[PDB]
């Protein structure tokens, strides 16, 4: 069956056009709605269609966010179209997104099943691209709130990583409360466990640190069996937070007395042959104090990514690395002078 719809381009102009697609199949289902895979009739290009129930009287948070973003490390919104929801206010919003065949989750699972660690060059490549996508979204005040390997899409040949699923994302505004029960448990920042509602985009940096640690370990670093058990898992590594760290996580939370537990050494958390720069980076992301975590741009400039800035760098398959230095004024806005460190001499315009 060939489906023809009138759809609006994702970036702009707001001028609708006929879009035809075929080979429709369900590739995901959840509370949010349904995700389909389809093929565009014009170009033969594969797309993902996310279908969500929408309130007519309200703007869709996910669409608003998606229409703003144009970055090589974020799944592009090609088109969007509305479909009839039967009920007066109920309509369905359909997001036509670029299809990406793999995930960091599946790639890491493959290596984990084979009892081998993902090669360090891919850990550098995937993590660097994730930090770039985070630097970009955070510059608009957008927090993803669901950073996990499953939401990190991969083109297996080019090693291009694209951040997906903006279903939990929100444009954070200081002084406007946010829900504390957010994120996929294993990747949930400790301030969220402590019930903070005044949190920042640094919760995504905690989650990025969890992804990194997982790529190094071959399993999640903090596999909590519940919300309370999630903190138990964190304490086994970080030890107990100090009175100052508690205040920094949630100033509305007070705990009179508690037994103090020392941190477990980072070098013992990981396997002996773990690259020390990867452990060092990880120690600067998985911090109780949210403001002490590296910003995504600071993480991109970390010495762990120095190999990516080498002019002679190549993928193990022999191909060139994807675009790594095409930074924009928007992406560099949090710290513009950092550009001269992030953009190596060989990458600069002739």
């Amino acid at each position: 069956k060939v489906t023809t719809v009138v759809a609006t381009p994702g970036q702009g102009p707001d001028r609708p056009q006929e879009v035809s697609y075929t080979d429709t199949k369900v590739i995901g289902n959840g509370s949010f709605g349904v995700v389909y895979q389809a093929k565009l009739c014009d170009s033969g290009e594969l797309v993902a269609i996310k279908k969500v129930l929408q309130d007519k009287r309200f703007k869709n948070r996910e669409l608003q966010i998606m229409r703003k973003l144009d970055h090589c490390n974020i799944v592009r919104l090609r088109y969007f179209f509305y479909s009839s929801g039967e009920k007066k206010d109920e309509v369905y919003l359909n997001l036509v997104l670029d299809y990406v065949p793999e995930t960091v989750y599946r790639v890491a699972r493959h290596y984990s099943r084979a009892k081998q660690t993902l090669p360090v060059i891919y850990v550098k490549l995937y993590m660097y691209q994730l930090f770039r996508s985070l630097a970009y979204i955070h510059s608009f005040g957008i927090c993803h709130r669901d950073i996990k390997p499953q939401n990190l899409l991969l083109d297996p040949d080019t090693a291009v990583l694209k951040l997906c699923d903006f279903g939990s994302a929100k444009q954070l505004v200081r002084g406007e409360p946010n829900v504390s029960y957010i994120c996929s448990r294993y990747y949930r920042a400790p301030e969220l466990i402590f019930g903070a509602t005044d949190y920042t985009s640094s919760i995504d940096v905690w989650s990025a640190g969890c992804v990194l640690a997982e790529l190094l370990l071959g399993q999640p670093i903090f596999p909590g069996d519940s919300g309370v058990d999630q903190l138990v898992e964190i304490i086994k590594v970080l030890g107990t937070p100090t009175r100052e760290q508690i205040r920094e996580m949630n100033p509305n939370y007070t705990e009179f007395k508690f037994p103090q537990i020392k941190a477990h050494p980072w070098t013992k958390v990981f396997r002996p042959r773990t690259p020390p720069e990867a452990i060092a980076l990880c120690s600067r992301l998985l911090e109780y104090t949210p403001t002490a975590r590296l910003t995504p741009l600071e993480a991109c400039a970390h010495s762990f990514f120095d190999e990516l800035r080498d002019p002679n760098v190549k993928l193990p398959n022999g191909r060139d690395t994807p675009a790594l230095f095409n930074f924009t004024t928007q992406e560099l806005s949090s710290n513009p002078p950092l550009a001269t460190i992030l953009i190596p001499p060989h990458a600069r315009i002739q």
């Binding site: 919300g227 309370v228 138990v232 508690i246 037994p259």
Partner: peptide, 25 residues
């Protein structure tokens, strides 16, 4: 469950209980 965490947060007993659960196993 989720009710337990909310209660621990409101009562200010979250760290004490997490430390107890660590030692319990």
């Amino acid at each position: 469950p989720h009710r337990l965490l909310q209660q621990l947060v409101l009562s200010g007993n979250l760290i004490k209980e997490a430390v107890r659960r660590l030692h319990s196993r």
